[PDB]
């Protein structure tokens, strides 16, 4: 699981 | 699962 | 599952 | 599943 | 399943 | 671009 | 770009 | 870019 | 970039 | 960048 959130 | 969210 | 959301 | 959403 | 939505 | 090979 | 190989 | 190999 | 190898 | 090898 990879989450990139901005 | 890959989530890229901006 | 790949989600790209802007 | 691939979702590209803008 | 591929969804491209703008 | 979405590539699925079975 | 999403690549899935089975 | 998401790469999954089985 | 996410790389998963099985 | 996330790399997972099995």
Numbering used by the authors:
A (entry chain A), B (entry chain A), C (entry chain A), D (entry chain A), E (entry chain A), F (entry chain B), ...: 1 to 6
What does the paper behind this entry write?
Aggregation-prone-motifs (APRs) of proteins are short segments, which – as isolated peptides - form diverse amyloid-like crystals. We introduce two APRs - designed variants of the incretin mimetic Exendin-4 - that both display crystal-phase polymorphism. Crystallographic and spectroscopic analysis revealed that a single amino-acid substitution can greatly reduce topological variability: while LYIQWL can form both parallel and anti-parallel β-sheets, LYIQNL selects only the former. We found that a simple change in crystallization temperature or modest changes of chemical composition of the solvent system (therefore the available interaction partners) can prompt formation of significantly different nanostructures: we identified four different polymorphs of the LYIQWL and two of the LYIQNL APR peptides.
We previously characterized the APR of the Tc5b miniprotein – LYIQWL –, and found that it is able to form polymorphic amyloid crystal structures with both parallel and antiparallel β-sheets. To study the potential interference of TFA, we have lyophilized the peptide in HCl, and crystallized it again from 10 v/v% ethanol. Interestingly, crystals grown at 37 °C (in the absence of TFA) consisted of parallel β-sheets. In this case a simple temperature change lead to an anti-parallel/parallel switch: starting solutions of completely identical chemical composition resulted in amyloid-like crystalline phases of entirely different topology. On the other hand, in crystals from the present work, grown from a solution containing less ethanol and no residual TFA, neighbouring β-sheets run parallel to each other, resulting in two larger class 4 and two smaller class 1 interfaces leading to an overall class 4 topology. The hydrophobic residues (Leu1, Ile3, Trp5) form clusters in both structures, while hydrogen bonds are formed by chain termini, solvent molecules, Tyr2, Gln4 and Trp5 of chain A in the class 4 structure. A common structural feature in the two parallel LYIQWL structures is the presence of a weak Tyr – Tyr interaction. The geometric parameters characterising this interaction are similar in the two structures: the distance between the centres of the aromatic rings are 5.6 Å and 6.1 Å in the class 1 and class 4 structures, respectively, while the angle between the planes of the rings are 81.9° and 86.7°. In contrast to the class 1 structure, the class 4 structure did not contain ethanol molecules – only a water molecule could be identified in the electron density map. This suggests that the presence of an increased amount of ethanol is able to induce an anti-parallel to parallel reorientation of β-sheets, even without forming direct ethanol-peptide contacts within the amyloid nanostructure.
